[PDB]
Design an enzyme around this catalytic site. Structure first.
Site, mmCIF file in Angstrom:
data_model
loop_
_atom_site.group_PDB
_atom_site.id
_atom_site.type_symbol
_atom_site.label_atom_id
_atom_site.label_comp_id
_atom_site.label_asym_id
_atom_site.label_seq_id
_atom_site.Cartn_x
_atom_site.Cartn_y
_atom_site.Cartn_z
ATOM 1 N N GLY I 51 6.147 4.206 -7.469
ATOM 2 C CA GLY I 51 6.496 5.490 -8.044
ATOM 3 C C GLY I 51 6.981 5.332 -9.487
ATOM 4 C CB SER I 80 3.433 -0.180 -7.693
ATOM 5 O OG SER I 80 2.037 -0.195 -7.456
ATOM 6 C CG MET I 81 8.319 0.760 -10.172
ATOM 7 S SD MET I 81 9.355 -0.425 -11.063
ATOM 8 C CE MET I 81 10.603 -0.574 -9.782
ATOM 9 C CG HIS I 105 -0.765 -1.968 -9.906
ATOM 10 N ND1 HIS I 105 -1.379 -0.971 -9.170
ATOM 11 C CD2 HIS I 105 0.420 -1.449 -10.318
ATOM 12 C CE1 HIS I 105 -0.597 0.099 -9.140
ATOM 13 N NE2 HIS I 105 0.501 -0.166 -9.825
ATOM 14 C CG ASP I 152 -4.580 -1.860 -7.444
ATOM 15 O OD1 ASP I 152 -3.846 -1.727 -8.451
ATOM 16 O OD2 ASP I 152 -5.025 -0.898 -6.784
#
Lengths: 178, 172, 175, 176, 177, 175, 174, 178, 173, 174, 174
Positions: I51, I80-81, I105, I152
């Site tokens: 996010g 991700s985060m 990523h 990714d």
């Protein structure tokens, strides 16, 4: 909840657009505080762009009807009916914070019928316009003719300009400012 | 196409709502027919519920401006500006078919200052249309004021008796 | 185009809903054919569910106004103003194909102050009375028959429409 | 344009849903071809899923009304009113291409109960009328058609032939 | 078609809102008629509520640029840029029909961006407002200050009021000038 | 039709937004007029708010590629790519009508950072390229155009002339 | 109409997105011009952001199939399948206008894993095939095209010329 | 609930866009904490992209009006009015976490030209007022703020410190210096 | 309610997208637990697709700011985060369940060219900064993270362990 | 909550449009207050533009049915059914604040047979409301027919002179 | 909350459209009040335009099933299933307020022919069943109800009393 706790200190808020339901909630709190203690000031904090004229009048007439002085404080902004209500607090007890903004203007409709009906509603709107200018002139101790010119289009005022206009009494920078 | 052909018989139609674009097309045909022959009648057939007042006035003033008599015929209905235009044909040459219907009524549709300006203009329009209609019908202004306060539906015979048309045509 | 060629044979079509634009196109063709030859029959073919009453009246009055007999033929269906117009053809020259269907009924609104509602309700009832009287005339029947038979949707076969007086003959082929 | 040219050869097409506009266009062509030559066959090519019953009846009655034999040919499919019209061509001149498909079924569709009663009764009248006419087209018993149209009934070209709905299957022009 | 036929009589129409499309079509007809005969009047018939200011200016400058006098006639209404263009016809050849209506007013935008950008576009709009008032004052033979006062809000005029104002020269009931 | 007729007089219009379709139609007319007569001026009339940069470049390169001088005339407005194209007419033959308006500004418009970097880099290339070409059109310093296109820069006809964007203002055919 | 007039001069346009219908219209014009005169060059003018790969291949194969040389000219832009088609004109007759822009990149786009596998392989085949054909068009190594199409690769007219994508930049008729 | 418990530690949050409702809720908490103890610091934690200017001013003026020092802490980001409010905490008690981000810029947004003129001038007044107040918060020249807010200006925590917008960067509960 | 009960055991959840609201709720719980006992570990359970980067940084800096060790546990996924925060737990106390999945990523997202330049530069700064911090979390070279986050990059629990992103995979206790 | 508190002082509010749901909530409070004390006045505060006629009648009939006097107070506005209900308070106990506004007007908004039935019913409603309003105002039926043909706006003093309210209250005087 | 309190006085409300969920809530209250005291009347207050027939029948059958008399009171309006339920209260204990309105009418709704036949038959069964039950409620002939429900039939309180639909009109206590 926080607003109920501040109501204990006799603080009432008007925040956002004036609608029937937001105005009546203010009216209810005013009546409640008068019942709790009719001899103590009420602090009416206003951050509003305005809204329904009749909804604002219900607040206005209640402010004048109850026994407590209703002190008004502008935080953020008091525009249109918001500024009307601010100007309507007990004279001598109408305040703004230093970076508050005030705006006054003539009535404004957004968005029909037979010419006869349009005539009727146009006449009512002009009555409202004259009535608000007369009441505002009294609130500001100014000439009716001053309010008529000064509300022809949107008229933005700093706190200092609103004071100089007669719309508020004092600008409060902190508690020492009184 | 069929409408071009009927135009050579000097028949012009107003069908459906009066808009700038439908009114100007009528104006164009009126000017065309006058140019083709300024001394022959034009037959303006009207089946319309009304529409824009200014668009109708462009037709109206053109009808009165050109040299040919503009005869009007109501088929189906002539309501509001439709009835205004019907009543505006050359006196003596305003007709309706037997089951046509006519309806007349008063006009129908920011800052207070602006609302005042437009309300005033609308009432001017209302008074102007009543005065012109009274002239078309050879009636008192006060009759038209009274009779257009709300929707006033008329049969062909009632429109004739009112002065809005001259005669009802069953057949030729 | 095909419809212009059939217009040469004096065939006019009403297909689909009766609107101001579709009705006036019929009116225009009727006037055109009368001008081309005022003494020859016109064949008005109707496959329509009905539509605007005032638009239909413009066709109706034009049918009665021009000098040619307007013969009517129902193909597929003639309902509401469609059936009104079918019943309005020159008596003796109103036809239906064998599997056509007819339907008649009272006026129907699909869509103000009490004063205004009163005015428009009275106009609608006038229309209802007027259509029943004219239909009774077309069918050589009593007004009271049409009032009772149009209270709700009344579907008729070709054969029932003939017996009702709405059409004169059913055409099965060219005999 | 290509369709006008094929109309020269007395070929009329029904393609896609049967509507008032598409049905009347067929009716117009049928009347035109009869006027051009009342003694020559018309070839009515049908690739249609069906559509409005009253619109189809306008075609049907016109087919039976005009003097020329209307020969029918199913290409792709003839379903519902499409199959009705196919079955309605001049007996002996109803054809399908080998991979055509036919489907028959019963009719398929607010207000006061009185109105719903009126329209339900009209729909059942239509159902019985179509079964009676179809039985006549297929030289079959009414009861067979009632049975066989209760739900969607898909037929190959051979099955439609054996049912009585068409007369012959044409693979190329040498079949007849 | 009917409009092509009337173009042979040197009649050009502006009907409905002034857009780039509709204005350029007028410009094209004006250029065409000048080419066909640069010495004969053009009759510009206007029934319009207004529209794009720059689109109207393209018509305006073309009217003044071509050799033929462009006579203007208001039928139905000429409001905003419509009234501007009407007032811009060859002086002495600006007409209205008796029940025409004229309306004039200051520019009207139905602004997004940074304050710097809003400042730039607000300036430009005020330039347009003064420019239109000065050109209108010249068209009407009136003081700039009159036009400033009279366009502050929507100002509706009858044909006679537009004549008295200087916006048109005569009202035509039928041909008797 | 009127535009075909004006094309005989070698008048080409750009009206409204510059798109691939509207730009290529201009390109086609330019090529057509060159073929009809490679030695006669073309009159390119521009009333446009701008649009696609690549679509405008297709017009631009065609203007410079064909043999005829392309004279430009601003009517109504020439903004963004519209003003670019106006400034690109044959020097000495770039005109505006007296109440025309010109506006110039820098270019104005999702994925991985790598992709955003690539497209940001391309946009800045476009910005420099347009400033360099505009500076040449106006015989001005690159640094003047950089400064003067940072935000929307509206010019009257007289300001555009003084800037070097057009050569003369035409009030009528005197001038 | 103007485009029919330019077709007489053997000019064919591809403008805007490559779709089945816009590509087939080009194919039709190419076949028409070959029939009219199989021995004269065709001038294929391209201002396109790309579009359907299979639609572009129909143009491509038609270009190579007909007898006339198809000369290509980039005006405005030739991106993705647009640039592919530009690079595919008769070698020596591939041109761009001076402010044209070219862009090349790899291909860019629900069900069961099995189906996703099938379509992912097909997409990678397409990617491989386009790089191979582009390398031939540009007389460059396959590995150069793989490297240079991994992300959007914008080229000026001069860069496209050095890359091998076009032959000459045309400023005018001189 | 968790936010009420942190309020007893005198922690107030501004999270997400500044609206009339979210700003007034902050104002209410500030007034509540002052009433509970006017002599103890308040910790105003800010993770906000900005929002309404008048709503932010209501917070701002309340921060300056009440007796307690309002210490500010930027976590995540403080952009636009968010950064304004961060810069407005009691000088010496304005903090950011090490990977916080700050962004400052000029104000960012129908009718008759007269009305557009009125609102354009009000917007420019706001722009000048915010630059003056920000310059005071940062002890910088007005001309620096005008220059540095013309477009979006992103700052790391150290850049915001060097700019004068915050006083210290806190990596942990150590980190604090005089 | 169940989450308040688990908070007594010092369990904090990040579930679903990281927003300002969801991140600040985590920050609030972290501050609460530190106040309740600054010397006891916090267990930060992460099932998140990622996010807002700035919202995640508010969690990140709070994790590093408070005294307690923040142990992280990946259940379901940390992408991700989400994976950034997982990798940021106290070294030695970063865990994943055996069928967890990790994905890393590069960052992933109108107006004047000048503005687009400003925001493109800020985005590349963010990309740079996240790769540097991730390299530290994983004890890997900056250049490894640049190469491995270009597109990714999905990792099993053991691949994430091998990469340096987590310390151990927990099958049971 | 504040409204429950004010209910303990026998204050009931009608705010905004009269719907089945908002009208029944008023009815419920009226019944509750009567049960709590059938001999004490109820204060019905009205700020409403009107709404459903049948919903308003449920309030109206309940006002007349219960034992307590229902005093009415107009704040802001009482329009249409709002003004009807205001005019319906216990005579002598109908009030408005000084800048309140009142508006009265006639009622406002299938097969011909059905349209006839509903048009009938609407005109019955129109006459019934004029009859009841005339009673409330001690005025002639013909006055109300004349005065409700179109929207009729009244100041507090005009409503008092009309007979719609008894007294204008500036403050906690009287 | 106010409705819970009024429930303690054995007052149950039906307000607005009859749905499965609003009808079952009424059923639940009826069962609750019977359990609390099976020998005391229940007061069922109805302000409803009608709604689902099967949902109304669930209320109806529950009214008849429980031991307490269910007294009904029409306030505002009782139309369609609303009027059905009003007419279904314990005979002698069915009331309306003076300006209430009642409306009755035949059922109203808004596949394959076989399916349409099935549902049309079911609808006509419902129509006859409701007319028979209504005739019993009103002590009137089935043929009267058939005639009087063919189209929308609006009744004043006095007309509903004369019809047999209610027993008494209540002004105050009378």
């Amino acid at each position: 909840d926080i607003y109920s706790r501040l109501l204990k200190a006799r603080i009432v808020f008007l925040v956002g657009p004036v609608t029937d339901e937001s105005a009546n909630l203010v009216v209810a709190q005013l009546l409640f505080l008068e019942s709790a203690n009719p001899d103590k000031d009420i602090f009416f904090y206003i951050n509003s762009p305005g809204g329904s004229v009749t909804a604002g009048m219900s607040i206005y007439d209640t402010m004048n009807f109850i026994k407590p002085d209703v002190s008004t404080l502008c935080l953020g902004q008091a525009a249109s009916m918001g500024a009307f209500l601010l100007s309507a607090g007990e004279k001598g007890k109408r305040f703004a914070l230093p970076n508050s903004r005030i705006m006054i203007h003539q009535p404004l409709i957004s968005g029909g019928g037979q010419a006869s009906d349009i005539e009727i509603h146009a006449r009512e709107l002009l009555k409202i316009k004259e009535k608000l200018n007369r009441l505002m002139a009294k609130h500001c101790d100014r000439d009716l003719a001053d309010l008529e010119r000064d509300t022809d289009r949107d008229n933005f005022m700093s706190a200092e300009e609103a004071k100089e206009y007669g719309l508020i009494d004092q600008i409060l920078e902190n508690r020492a400012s009184l």
